[model samples]
Target: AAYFQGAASTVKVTEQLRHCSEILKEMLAKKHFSYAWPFYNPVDVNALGLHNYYDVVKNPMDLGTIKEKMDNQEYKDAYKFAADVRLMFMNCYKYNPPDHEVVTMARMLQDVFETHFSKIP
Candidate 1:
């Protein structure tokens, strides 16, 4: 970890996020639901994980800035994923997605986190 030795690696937010991604992946992959840690809870994890991806995007263009259909090839994949989930949550709130729907959405989110965390150093 970038922080095993305090101030040793100067871990950036991005690096810290990358570190978080892996722990998430392990939890999902192993279905270790009985864990004891506070954040080990799945619900708590979901609530915060989105913002991690959101930070990765950190698009100069805030939400709803682009009215017309545009391209995403201009940005990094992390940005694209973040923007996408932002839109997904917005729509979910706008329409108040049902329990089953949100569960599926959570699964989708799981895939996202699992994918990136699976790639950590």
Candidate 2:
């Protein structure tokens, strides 16, 4: 008798989006990279009493959220993916002090992403 447990389907993504997704995942995999963890998830504005965060950062984003967007096929092109990635880092730069740890990580992460992204073409 044949038996099966569970099944799944391949999540299809455009060629460009696949490459961009890889960059996002790579950043998240870097456990040794200082400040990487902070950008993994959405900032809990309420928990941190950062009520003004959303007001200033109209396009707040994070690595995890970006991954979701890829999975959901919300990105239409490579540029859109890059835009969100840049927006995430820019939001950190805008909301946090120049010397803040989040700002430092944002810069580092963006550098890593752009370097890899350049090879996608």
Q: For each candidate in the order shown, give its overall lDDT on alpha carbons.
A: 0.41, 0.80
Question: In model 1, which runs have C-alpha deviations exceeding 4 angstroms?
Answer: 1-72, 106-111, 114-121
How does residue 86 of candidate 1 score in lDDT?
Answer: 51
C-alpha RMSD in Å of predicted model 1 compared with the true structure: 14.0
lDDT of 2 by residue, 8-51 (tens): 11232355667887787788886526868888889999999998
Clashing pairs in 1: none
Query: Which numbered prediction scores highest in lDDT against the true structure?
Result: 2
Give per-residue CA lDDT, model 1, range 22-90, as digits (tens): 443443443543321222222222565554443443332322222111232332334454454355344
* Per-structure clash totals for the candidates: 0, 0
